[PDB]
Structures are given as C-alpha cells and as structure tokens.
C-alpha cells in the first residue's frame, strides 16, 4: 500500500515543479499509473486478507474502494480542466494538490487497521472538500453549504471519538483484527445503546440518513464538479465502510437499535425518490437519487446478512460510478448554458447524438437494469429485506417504479423533444468530455462481466 | 520609550514568572506575579489614549484583588502550619480561594469579562504577551499543587470557560477579542485536565502559544484588527492565507493538524477517570468555537472580498516584517501530528 | 457603482483551432494531452489491468474449494459416511455444563 500512496504523494512535486503547459498531462498520466499499480492488491488467491504492516491492510471490501478512489482522480482532473483554464496557474496547481490530498487520505482510510487512523483521516477529508466547494464554486450559497457539510459531520463524529476512546480504555488496542476475535457481547444497557448511537450517528450523517441529509444537495449543487464526483462516489461510502467495520463490536444491540434506521431509510428513500420525481435542478435530482440509493445500503448494513453486505458493496461501487457519470453529464450542459435548470435545454440528441447514449446508459444504470451491478445490489439487498420481513418489498417496488420514472423523465425532458433553437452556444462536444463518460461506463460493463471482485467480506 | 527603560521593563517581565517558578516560597511566587503586573502596564499604556488607560486600569484593578486573595490564602496557610508552602492537609477553603483568584488572573469564566476588553484596548503586541507570557506563572502555581485541588469547581470553571469563549467569539468582528475568547476556551481545556496528568496542560499551553503568536504577527503585518481589514489580504500579503487557514483550523481542533492532539489526549486522560459527559460537552462546544474561525477564513481566503484603490501603493512598496519565526511556529503547528508520542 | 469588470460574454472555441480536443488552447498541448490520456487510460490500463485481473488464479479460493469438495464427497460417499454432518465440532472435544 505504501507503494500506492508514496507515488500519490510525489504527484504533488510533479504538479508544483512541472511547467504550466505540462502540469495536467504528466499528473493525469501518472495518476492513471497509480490506478494501475493499485490493482496488485486484487491478488487474493487465498481467504486470508492482506496485512502489509500494523498501519495498512486490504480486504475484499477495502480494495474496490481503493481502486475506485484511484480511478476517479484522473476523471476529477480532466473534468476540472475546461473550467479554471483561464485561472492563474498557482490556483490550478492548488486545485490539483487538493484532489491529490483527497486521494491520499481516502486510500489511507480504506487501508487502515485501527479506528483512530480511520477517524482522523475521515475527518481530515473535510478540509479539501470545504476548500473546493467554497473557493471554486460559482454560487453564493456555497458558504452555507460548506458550513452544513462540515458541522453535520463534526457533530456526528465527536461522539464517535468518545466511543472509540471508551473502547480503547476497555480493550487496549482499538485495532480491527483483534476486536473481531475478542468481542464480548453487551449487557443491553442504556449506556451501551448510547454507545451504539454514538458509533453510528457519525456515519449515518454521511451515508446519509433521511433525517439528516440536507448537507448533500447543498454541496452537490455548489461543488464545482469534482467535489460532486468525490462526495457522491467515496465520501458517502466512507460511512458504509465504517458501519460495516464497527458493527462487529455492537452485537446484539443491532437487533433492536436498527429498527428506526432501517425504517427511516426505507420511507425516506421513497420520499427522496419522489423529490427526484419533481425537481427543477438537475444536480439536485442526482443528489436526491443518491440519498435514495444510499438508504438501501443503510438498511442492508443494519440487517447484517451475507447477501446484504454483498449487494451493499455492489451498489456502493455501481452508484459511485453512475452518479459521477451523471454529474459529469449535467456539467457538460452547464458549461454551455451556465444554468442547472433542466427544462431550459430540453431538445438535445439532435446536436449531441453520442452524448445522448451515455445519458441513456447512465439512467439505465441508475435504475435497475438487470445485467448490471446496480440491479444485482438492489436485488440481493431486496432478498435480504424480504428474509427480514416480507412486507418491505411493498416499499421497494414503489421506489423501483419511481426510479424508472424520474430517470426516464430526466432523459426525455433533457434530450427528447423540440430543440432550443435559441442556443447558438451549444458547442458540439469535447473528446475530453466523451472520454470522461467512456472511462465511467466501461468499468461498469467490465465489473458486470466479472463481479467476483465486487463482492465483499462474505463471498 | 528609551532603551534603559525598555531593558528594565522587559527584564522585570522576564523575571516575574521566572521568580514564580524557581521559588518554593509562595510569597515569592506572589512577588513574581506582582512583577508581571507592575511591568506590563507601561506597555499597555504606551500610546496614551482613553482605550489604553481603561485597559490598564481594568487590568490593574482586576489583578490586584486576585493578588490580595492569593496572599490571604498564603497567610492563612502559614498561620495553620507555620510554612510558606501548600502542603497536603491544608484547608479546602484556602485552596479554593487560591484557585478562584488564579482563575481571575488567567481570565477563566465567570471571571472572564475583563480579558476581551483589555485585549481590545491595546496594540497587537502586549496582546501576545498578555495571552502567552502572563498565563504561564499563574499556571505554574496550579501545576505545583495539582493533587490538592477540587475536581468539582476546576471542571465547572473549565466548562464555563469553554461555553462563554465559544459564545463570545461567535459574534466578534474585532480580532483582538476573538483571540481573547480563544484564550479563555483553551485555558478551560487546560484547567479541566490540570488535576489529571498536568503535563497535558503544558502541552496545550505550548500548542496555544505556538498558534496565537503567529496569528498576532499576521495581524501585526498590516495592523489588522477587523474582519474587513484581514479580508484585504489577498491584495497586500497573499502568501499568508495558507498558514492563516491551517493555523485557524488548528486552533479549532481538527485531526491532521496538531491542534486536535491536545483535545484528543485530554479527552483520553479524562475518559480514563470517568469524566465522560463533561468531556463530551467540551468536545461539542469546541465546534462552536471552530465556527467563527471557519467564517473568518471564509472572509479572508476563500471568497476574497472587495479591495480599495489605495491598496496598490502597498503593492508597489516592499515589506520586511516577517521575522523568520512566523514560518517556524506556523509549520511546527499544522504539521506535527505524527510526532505526537514525542510531544504528549 | 463599485468599479468591477463586466460579465465576459461567451466564447466559442472551434472558430479558433477547429481540431480542439477539450484540454488546452495551444493546438499541440491539446494533442499531447488527448494522446496521453487515451494511451494511459485505455491502451495500458483498461487492457493490461483486464488481463492481469482475468489471470488471477483461485480468486478467494474458488477453484480450490470445488476441487477439495469433489475429493471430499468422493471419500464420504465411497465410505458411506454422512455427507456434511450436522455439527462442525464433534462433542468429543466439548464440555457442556450440568443443568
């Protein structure tokens, strides 16, 4: 892992020492090479997970997130290349440094063995994200959005610090290899239920839950683009990974401390997909869809079954890819119209025939198209929820319907129909922003072809 | 001022605390505190304006009463035991009176109403001294008697300092008061743990000094005393935004910066002694302490404000003000978390 | 008013450099960024990674497990043994409490 993160660190010299006209190309190529070198830890010929040192490790859960975090950096990097092109070069290099820092910190999170390393990095990620949203966003509510995003997460995380301190003072190590082999069952006291809540209401803030998700649309709308990519793709998964790692030392409380959150996730998933169904801002449509999809993962982890964890990992990676793709697709029109409203441009597929295929495939991925790792995840967690209770499918089907509806409607009223003849500035396309969608969609096809990698602990 | 006077006054300020440390006699500790008191005033009052006169009067009148209360405690101890040292088996009333007087000396709430005013009424220097060099010897008194202290009101004073510092610094446009309320909150963090492993008090003190001194220098470099004055920094001194950002985000304890280390290990050593929920309250109000730092670095760094036409002369002319220790103190802060076991 | 510059009207690129690729304003940097991205993104990553991943042997012990299962059911059904007994640990090395 050290061989993966040290090159990511030396990418910062490669930014600040390279000339202004050879500072995107070199860093992008070398970031692709880091994404390549981050495929050796797929070499799992044996059931025993990979431990390189006391610091870092790698499991069938951590490794997909590692590879995706490495992959999304070039995409961030080229999507952030058409805007801030007339910006000063020091400002460019500062942006590149912020993204590389995010990459490094997130890989250090997913590879970590202790919970406090995970905590400090999980909470260190907030600084680059805040900077990206506030310094490079275009609107004026970016400040309130960064405030929301920062303080929701901190309010959630501080009880987690206290609970982890309690666990360290009880056990001694706070390391994950040992806390699985030594987990005495809990007395089911009010104090231990508070401990459960403290451990869980830092990730549930971030996944997010329907009671607390208002930080997510405010940030997605106003994160320039790459903030939306990361904040949809891996920063929500930073809560899923954390819940899966921490739920091992909390049995049997999860059998009854989970009911409110399973329930809130399901109902608020319907509510958020309904919000998606009737919405003016496209980058908020994607946001509420992200809430609706992460709620299923919350419910799945709360059920804590093998199929459920499997489908949760599948849906994690699939949603990350497809949501980053949708954000890039909407930015492709924002860079011409400079307006996020969807009804403005409502007659494309004349000028943009090829981009309208990426729209279609992304939507078919957003909804449950069967030969795809999205429907696999949704279907396995639905089977889990049915084994839990046979009445959850009543909710899941309503959401399936709504998720077909808002996706097809988005396609229709953004592409299909009469062209806006009053839009001369609808430039045809960029090879850059076609390669973005290609690099997003081809991994989905390949993971669907070989999904033995996209499972997790239980397979 | 003239050089002989400055030598005298600065030497007296150096010897106040240095007498207060190397002194077993509590009477000589009191002497050192009075030296600091007596010698700081000529420099609080060096500009000779009503704000400076009021600041110096408030400082003198607030510190003299605390000095007299500490002397009452010392005289009572001598009457009780015939010794000029706080042994064990003294009176809790004596020890608590001492602690309250020292709290009035530092600035801890509810004895905090004098520090923001005084720090507002004086230059950027002598706020630095007032917040760093004058906190040390009062802390030395507590450090030398940490087992004798009441765990109850020590923590009530701490918690009150945290709450009041956060809610004070939330709404201050003047920076000389924001730094004072930060001082109040940090002294709360110190004095909470002072009966528990007092080395962490000195840790938080050194961290707080290493943060505040660069900050006061940053304000010195353009005589900044307002949010709207530090907001005109992308035009005057635009290479300081990075360090100001990282040091404010250190003052508000965030993980990768070393300003989260004191809060973290303080909560650790409190959770070791079952001070769970008080620690939770302090940790949660530190976020309210962080909010105005976030607003501040928004105002100056991330959403660069309108400037003036006369600020272009500043661009023409040159500066010599950064003293080569700004960089060092700002880089030992913001970047020295992995050396935490070497710090503790 | 407060002396700010005006809203810069929208620029079209392809009027200049109709071979614009989306990357830079210099025609050479455009080319040498798209070439590098295509190369280092498809030609080596998406190809060699796919091959490297396709040729990982016994990913999480799948072929080995089926092979062991084949020989084990062979043994158990040749010897007429109970295939996949109902308890992983035998009670010969377990000690329960009384009452």
């Amino acid at each position: 892992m050290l061989k993966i993160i040290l090159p990511s660190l030396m990418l910062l010299p490669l930014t600040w020492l390279s000339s202004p006209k050879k500072t995107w190309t070199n860093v992008t190529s070398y970031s692709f090479l880091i994404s390549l070198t981050s495929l050796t830890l797929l070499w799992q010929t044996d059931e025993n997970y990979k431990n390189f040192s006391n610091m870092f490790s790698s499991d069938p859960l951590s490794t997909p997130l590692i590879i995706l975090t490495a992959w999304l950096l070039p995409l961030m990097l080229m999507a952030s290349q058409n805007h801030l092109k007339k910006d000063n070069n020091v400002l460019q290099k500062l942006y590149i440094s912020m993204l590389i820092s995010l990459q490094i910190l997130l890989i250090m999170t997913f590879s970590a063995t202790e919970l406090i390393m995970f905590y400090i990095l999980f909470e260190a990620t907030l600084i680059p994200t805040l900077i990206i949203i506030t310094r490079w966003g275009n609107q004026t509510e970016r400040l309130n959005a960064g405030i929301y995003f920062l303080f929701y997460t901190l309010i959630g995380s501080i009880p987690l610090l206290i609970a982890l301190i309690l666990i360290q003072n009880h056990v001694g190590t706070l390391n994950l290899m040992i806390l699985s082999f030594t987990t005495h069952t809990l007395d089911a006291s009010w104090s231990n239920n508070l401990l459960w809540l403290a451990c869980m209401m830092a990730f549930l803030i971030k996944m997010p839950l329907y009671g607390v998700h208002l930080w997510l649309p405010k940030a997605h709308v106003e994160a320039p683009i790459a903030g939306s990519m990361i904040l949809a793709a891996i920063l929500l998964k930073l809560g899923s990974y954390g819940m899966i790692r921490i739920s091992i030392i909390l049995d049997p409380l999860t059998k009854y401390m989970a009911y409110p959150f399973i329930l809130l996730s399901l109902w608020g998933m319907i509510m958020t997909s309904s919000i998606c169904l009737r919405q003016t801002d496209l980058k908020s449509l994607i946001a509420y869809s992200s809430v609706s999809h992460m709620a299923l993962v919350i419910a799945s982890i709360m059920i804590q079954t093998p199929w459920s964890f499997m489908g949760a990992t599948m849906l994690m990676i699939a949603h990350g890819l497809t949501s980053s793709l949708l954000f890039c697709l909407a930015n492709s029109n924002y860079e011409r119209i400079h307006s996020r409203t969807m009804i403005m441009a409502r007659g494309l597929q004349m000028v943009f025939p090829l981009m309208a295929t990426w729209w279609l495939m992304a939507s078919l991925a957003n909804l449950a198209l069967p030969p795809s790792i999205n429907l696999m995840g949704e279907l396995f967690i639905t089977m889990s929820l049915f084994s839990w209770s046979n009445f959850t499918i009543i909710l899941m089907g309503i959401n399936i319907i709504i998720t077909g509806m808002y996706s097809m409607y988005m396609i229709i009223t953004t592409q299909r129909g009469k062209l806006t003849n009053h839009m001369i500035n609808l430039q045809p396309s960029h090879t850059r922003e076609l390669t973005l969608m290609a690099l997003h969609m081809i991994p989905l096809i390949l993971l669907t072809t070989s999904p033995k990698l996209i499972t997790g602990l239980t397979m | 001022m003239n050089p002989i006077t400055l030598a005298i006054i600065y030497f007296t300020i150096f010897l106040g605390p240095v007498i207060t440390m190397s002194s077993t006699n509590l009477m000589l500790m009191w002497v050192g505190l009075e030296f600091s008191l007596l010698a700081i005033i000529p420099m609080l009052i060096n500009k000779k304006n009503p704000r400076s006169t009021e600041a110096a009067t408030k400082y003198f009148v607030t510190q003299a009463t605390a000095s007299m209360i500490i002397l009452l405690a010392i005289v009572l101890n001598y009457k009780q035991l015939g010794t000029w040292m706080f042994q064990q088996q003294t009176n809790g009333l004596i020890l608590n009176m001492t602690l309250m007087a020292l709290s009035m000396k530092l600035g801890l709430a509810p004895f905090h109403f004098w520090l923001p005013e005084v720090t507002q009424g004086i230059p950027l220097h002598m706020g630095l001294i007032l917040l760093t060099w004058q906190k040390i010897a009062p802390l030395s008194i507590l450090i030398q008697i940490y087992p004798l202290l009441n765990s109850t009101i020590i923590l009530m004073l701490a918690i009150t300092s945290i709450f009041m510092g956060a809610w004070g610094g939330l709404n201050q446009t003047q920076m000389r008061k924001i730094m004072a309320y930060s001082s109040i909150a940090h002294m709360g963090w110190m004095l909470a743990i002072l009966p528990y492993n007092p080395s962490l008090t000195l840790l938080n003190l050194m961290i707080y000094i290493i943060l505040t001194a660069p900050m006061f220098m940053a304000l010195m470099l353009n005589n900044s005393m307002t949010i709207n004055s530090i907001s005109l920094l992308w035009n005057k001194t635009p290479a300081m935004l990075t360090m100001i950002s990282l040091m404010l985000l250190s003052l508000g304890g965030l993980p990768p910066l070393t300003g989260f280390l004191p809060k973290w290990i303080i909560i650790t050593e409190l959770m070791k002694n079952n001070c769970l929920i008080m620690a939770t309250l302090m940790a949660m109000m530190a976020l309210l302490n962080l909010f105005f730092y976030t607003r501040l670095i928004y105002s100056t760094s991330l959403t660069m404000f309108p400037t003036n036409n006369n600020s272009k002369m500043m661009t023409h002319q040159t500066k010599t003000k950064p003293n080569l220790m700004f960089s060092t103190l700002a880089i030992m802060s913001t970047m020295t978390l992995p050396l935490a076991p070497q710090l503790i | 008013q407060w002396q700010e510059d005006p809203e810069p009207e929208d620029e079209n690129v392809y009027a200049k450099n109709p071979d614009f690729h989306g990357y830079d304003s210099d025609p050479v940097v455009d080319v040498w960024n798209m070439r590098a991205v295509f190369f280092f993104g498809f030609s080596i990553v998406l190809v060699f990674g796919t091959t490297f991943v396709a040729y990982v042997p016994d990913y999480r012990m799948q072929e080995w497990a089926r092979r062991e299962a084949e020989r084990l059911v062979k043994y158990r059904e040749v010897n007429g043994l109970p295939i996949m007994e109902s308890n992983y640990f035998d009670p010969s090395k377990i000690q329960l409490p009384e009452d």
Binding site: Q139, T140 | - | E7
Partner: peptide, 19 residues
C-alpha cells in the same frame, strides 16, 4: 456565468461591532 465573489452588501454585515 461568472464566479460569485462578495459585494459591499456582503462585506458590510461584518461591520457592526457585535455581528
């Protein structure tokens, strides 16, 4: 169309001595 940076009605709300 352009990045929003503050204006006078934004900067003035930090000039009231109490906020």
């Amino acid at each position: 169309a352009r990045q929003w940076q503050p204006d006078i009605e934004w900067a003035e709300q930090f000039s009231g001595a109490v906020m």
